[PDB]
Amino acid sequence: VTEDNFVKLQVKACALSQINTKLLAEMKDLFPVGREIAGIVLDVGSKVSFFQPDDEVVGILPLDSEDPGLCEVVRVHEHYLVHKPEKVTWTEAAGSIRDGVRAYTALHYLSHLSPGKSVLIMDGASAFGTIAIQLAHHRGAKVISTACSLEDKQCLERFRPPIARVIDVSNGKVHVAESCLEETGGLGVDIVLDAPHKHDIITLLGVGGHWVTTEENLQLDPPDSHCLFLKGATLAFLNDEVWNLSNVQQGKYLCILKDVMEKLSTGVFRPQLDEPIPLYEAKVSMEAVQKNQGRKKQVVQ
Amino acid sequence: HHHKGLYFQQSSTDEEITFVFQEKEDLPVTEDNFVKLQVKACALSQINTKLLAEMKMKKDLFPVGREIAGIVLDVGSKVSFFQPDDEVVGILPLDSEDPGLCEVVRVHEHYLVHKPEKVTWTEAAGSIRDGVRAYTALHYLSHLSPGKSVLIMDGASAFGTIAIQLAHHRGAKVISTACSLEDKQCLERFRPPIARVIDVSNGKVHVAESCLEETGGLGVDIVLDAGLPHKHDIITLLGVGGHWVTTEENLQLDPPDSHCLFLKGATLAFLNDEVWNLSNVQQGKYLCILKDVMEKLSTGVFRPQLDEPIPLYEAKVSMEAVQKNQGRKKQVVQF
Numbered sequence: 001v002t003e004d005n006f007v008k009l010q011v012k013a014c015a016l017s018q019i020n021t022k023l024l025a026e027m028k029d030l031f032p033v034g035r036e037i038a039g040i041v042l043d044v045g046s047k048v049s050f051f052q053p054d055d056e057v058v059g060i061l062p063l064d065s066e067d068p069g070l071c072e073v074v075r076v077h078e079h080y081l082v083h084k085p086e087k088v089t090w091t092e093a094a095g096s097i098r099d100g101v102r103a104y105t106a107l108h109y110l111s112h113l114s115p116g117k118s119v120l121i122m123d124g125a126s127a128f129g130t131i132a133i134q135l136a137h138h139r140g141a142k143v144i145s146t147a148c149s150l151e152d153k154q155c156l157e158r159f160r161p162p163i164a165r166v167i168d169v170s171n172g173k174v175h176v177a178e179s180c181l182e183e184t185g186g187l188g189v190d191i192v193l194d195a196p197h198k199h200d201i202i203t204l205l206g207v208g209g210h211w212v213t214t215e216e217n218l219q220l221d222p223p224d225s226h227c228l229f230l231k232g233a234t235l236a237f238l239n240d241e242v243w244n245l246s247n248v249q250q251g252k253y254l255c256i257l258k259d260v261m262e263k264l265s266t267g268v269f270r271p272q273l274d275e276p277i278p279l280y281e282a283k284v285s286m287e288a289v290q291k292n293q294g295r296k297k298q299v300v301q
Numbered sequence: 302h303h304h305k306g307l308y309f310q311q312s313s314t315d316e317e318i319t320f321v322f323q324e325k326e327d328l329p330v331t332e333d334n335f336v337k338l339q340v341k342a343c344a345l346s347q348i349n350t351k352l353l354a355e356m357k358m359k360k361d362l363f364p365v366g367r368e369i370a371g372i373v374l375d376v377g378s379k380v381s382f383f384q385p386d387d388e389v390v391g392i393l394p395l396d397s398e399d400p401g402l403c404e405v406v407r408v409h410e411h412y413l414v415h416k417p418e419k420v421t422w423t424e425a426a427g428s429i430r431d432g433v434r435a436y437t438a439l440h441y442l443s444h445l446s447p448g449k450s451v452l453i454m455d456g457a458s459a460f461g462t463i464a465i466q467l468a469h470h471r472g473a474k475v476i477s478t479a480c481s482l483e484d485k486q487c488l489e490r491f492r493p494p495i496a497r498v499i500d501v502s503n504g505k506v507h508v509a510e511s512c513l514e515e516t517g518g519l520g521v522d523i524v525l526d527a528g529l530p531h532k533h534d535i536i537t538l539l540g541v542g543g544h545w546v547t548t549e550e551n552l553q554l555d556p557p558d559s560h561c562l563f564l565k566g567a568t569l570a571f572l573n574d575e576v577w578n579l580s581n582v583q584q585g586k587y588l589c590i591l592k593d594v595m596e597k598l599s600t601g602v603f604r605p606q607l608d609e610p611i612p613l614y615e616a617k618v619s620m621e622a623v624q625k626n627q628g629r630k631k632q633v634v635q636f
Contacts, residue, residue: 110566110568187582207576207577207580207582207583208441208576208583215559215563216560216563216564217556217559217560217563218554218556218559218563219554219555219556219559220552220553220554220559221553222551222552222553223551225549225551225552225553225554225571226550226551226552228571229549229550229551229552229571229573230352230355230573230576230579231571231573231576232442232570232571232572232573232576233570233571234442234568234569234570234571235568235569235570236567236568236569237559237562237563237565237566237567237568238566239563239564239565239566242541242542242564242565242566246541246542248519248541249541249542
């Protein structure tokens with residue numbers, strides 16, 4: 001049943017991602033599953049304006065969403081959605097909106113990319129890693145990335161615009177700090193995208209460098225935050241759902257989405273993702289995810 | 302022939318430093334990138350003995366004075382940006398051979414910019430370093446923008462004064478913590494009034510509760526902490542996506558603190574103006590910072606809280622007071 005100021009839409013694809021347990025636990029029946037949707041609006045509320053029925057859209061549902069994205073159709077507020085470009089497919093859209101958001105914030109809002117800069121994208125073979133690498137290349141950066149497996153290794157070396165260097169941590173040991181300092185020319189890396197232990201990162205960091213972490217419980221010792229002081233560095237925490245959970249950041253967020261699709265419309269992004277598996281056995285695919293397993297994005301169609 | 306220069310020496314078991322006048326020769330400029338300056342003004346700043354020690358320099362007498370404005374007397378062969386009679390201003394490197402507190406100084410050319418004529422010597426020397434700190438904290442570590450809220454520690458200091466002026470120039474609402482009585486009056490006398498002076502004379506206010514009052518619960522966008530509140534109250538008063546710019550060189554950040562930081566998507570940045578003259582890489586960026594600061598000064602958006610200038614012979618007493626951080630106005634030696 002539709003409510004006003006909300007929009008009913010018919011899902012065209014719903015990519016699924018890892019569900020964070022303790023974020024749900026700290027936030028306080030059923031746990032709705034599915035958030036990265038690319039659908040076609042059905043019925044419109046009485047006071048929604050930006051969307052008219054028979055329009056194709058893409059967006060990320062909020063954590064408090066009554067409806068679960070994994071469904072034939074769902075309801076969602078109109079300011080959680082954006083228009084999907086015509087050229088883009090719908091699996092591509094649903095699979096790229098979330099990782100594209102994260103890459104855009106991490107590399108554009110928590111750090112700044114420009115021609116000539118160096119960025120260490122850790123686990124570049126993950127879907128998020130792939131999208132992030134494509135952003136870095138699009139702006140003109142020199143990308144160093146970490147490969148955790150042989151599959152990841154040969155996955156990254158075959159990028160059409162080859163990355164500067166693939167450091168494989170797949171083996172027992174590798175001197176990541178020394179090798180990236182070696183690749184920069186003593187300068188160090190400008191942006192590290194945690195997405196090694198911290199002592200490799202802090203020495204790897206260049207002058208005024210940016211450490212964009214995702215660790216939700218980082219402990220910092222006075223000697224470490226001192227080496228950061230000597231380098232004039234910035235520690236930026238990447239948290240995906242601060243846009244959705246803050247009422248003021250409405251506009252910027254939307255623009256990100258609209259730009260994420262824009263590059264996807266001109267194909268500067270390309271997701272790396274599993275073949276489309278329909279609704280049925282989708283729960284088993286989600287079970288597989290939560291297992292800390294999966295380098296390819298998994299989208300339902 | 303020779304000139305009098307202020308130096309300092311350090312005892313072995315005491316980190317304390319003593320200041321001494323010593324006469325020494327003018328370093329000649331020859332077949333090098335160095336310029337020789339007639340020093341017109343040299344501002345004073347407390348010397349971080351620790352950072353200098355980490356630089357690993359082997360000296361028994363260390364030179365004093367780094368924030369200079371003067372006239373180019375001579376130039377080495379390779380110098381390009383300056384010719385004699387030019388009016389220059391700059392900050393001498395941490396590894397400088399010559400003291401800034403001396404009538405003549407020899408400095409590499411990639412440390413100076415030209416001085417605007419409307420700027421006096423004492424004003425330029427007394428604004429260069431603090432304007433740079435403020436500029437990189439509010440423009441490179443955080444990103445000032447009209448409408449944002451900026452909590453500035455002190456603000457009655459020289460740095461806090463330049464910073465408050467920068468924030469107002471960019472349409473920022475400023476919250477600032479006064480400590481002394483005289484500090485509170487000083488913050489009361491600002492030409493455009495700041496939004497909220499929180500008076501932490503004694504343990505009678507809460508800066509977190511007051512700042513959350515003013516912000517409406519959203520939180521402060523930019524915290525400038527340089528120059529008193531615990532780490533935790535900073536982290537609770539910080540807004541969503543906010544930037545915490547700190548002068549703390551030995552910060553203790555435990556996982557609860559960092560957890561609240563993550564949940565607010567907060568960036569933490571360290572303010573260290575030496576970062577350009579110690580690494581010596583993107584110094585051309587630093588140059589543009591100097592030129593913009595000097596422009597801001599010439600047009601009028603900066604007015605440093607200078608004290609009245611002093612002659613060179615009073616520079617060792619003054620420096621002594623500057624080393625203990627007794628005094629709020631900015632001391633500048635005039636020649």
